[PDB]
Amino acid sequence: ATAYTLNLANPSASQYSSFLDQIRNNVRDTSLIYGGTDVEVIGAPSTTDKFLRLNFQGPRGTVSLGLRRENLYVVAYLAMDNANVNRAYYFKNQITSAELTALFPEVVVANQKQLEYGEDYQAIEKNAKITTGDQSRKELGLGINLLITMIDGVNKKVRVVKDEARFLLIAIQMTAEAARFRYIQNLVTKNFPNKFDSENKVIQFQVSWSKISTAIFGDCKNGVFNKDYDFGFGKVRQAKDLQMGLLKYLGRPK
Ligand SMILES: Nc1ncnc2c1ncn2[C@@H]1O[C@@H]2COP(=O)(O)O[C@H]2[C@H]1O
Prior knowledge:
Elements: E1 3-7, H1 13-27, E2 51-58, E3 61-68, E4 74-80, E5 86-90, H2 97-103, E6 112-114, H3 121-128, H4 144-152, H5 161-180, H6 182-190, H7 200-207, H8 209-218, E7 220-221, E8 224-230, E9 235-238
Parallel strand pairs: 1-2, 5-6
Antiparallel strand pairs: 2-3, 3-4, 4-5, 7-8, 8-9
Helix pairs in contact: 1-5, 3-5, 4-5, 5-6
Bound molecules: adenosine-3',5'-cyclic-monophosphate.
Keywords: Allergen, Antiviral protein, Glycoprotein, Hydrolase, Plant defense, Protein synthesis inhibitor, Signal, Toxin
Function: Single-chain ribosome-inactivating protein.
Family: Belongs to the ribosome-inactivating protein family. Type 1 RIP subfamily.
């Protein structure tokens, strides 16, 4: 229903930052305070407003993403094909036809396509066919210019699974992950709008979102962890050193 648009025709570091803040502010419950920190926390699951729409507006067309508000999971995307026909692709265990119709009304039922693979990184990475290094998403890099190039592979083109997969990997990281982790957002704006190399720390943050959220939720007092934590990139005692942008909903503080 609610849609936020990122203007990639005229990219601005401030516009990108405000875009991420709109996402954070949309899903957060301001009454929730985890571990005495000021970091925003995703509110309890809504039965009425379940999805959020993100538009990537370019000079030659617009590609859209559909995200689940309860956990920021990307569940679908909208892109015009080679015949300029709007088509929606979705992950099966994530959304229904009726919900997809409401999310992307410009797409007719017949043009809704269920994706052959899973929504998890491993499954998408397999189809991305990355041939160098560890063959994971880290090998693609990050950045505004990279996102623009990836959109070019799906905007008004015949669907190719390899290009679709690579687009999804970058789109998920530049939106959902950047919203959750300010470290990722800061790398994007520091190198704006260039493509740059990703890091092990970027991946380490991503795989430990739940762990970090649980640690702040139940083992942190006034921003200080009760014990030392190491999520892969070193020992952390102060929650602020994590530069968190959005915490996972784990209930209300006890
Ligand atoms: N489709 C997706 N959309 C958004 N975020 C994802 C998606 N698939 C995986 N992730 C993230 O990858 C993370 C891996 O570890 P977590 O269980 O802590 O939390 C997971 C999610 O936050």
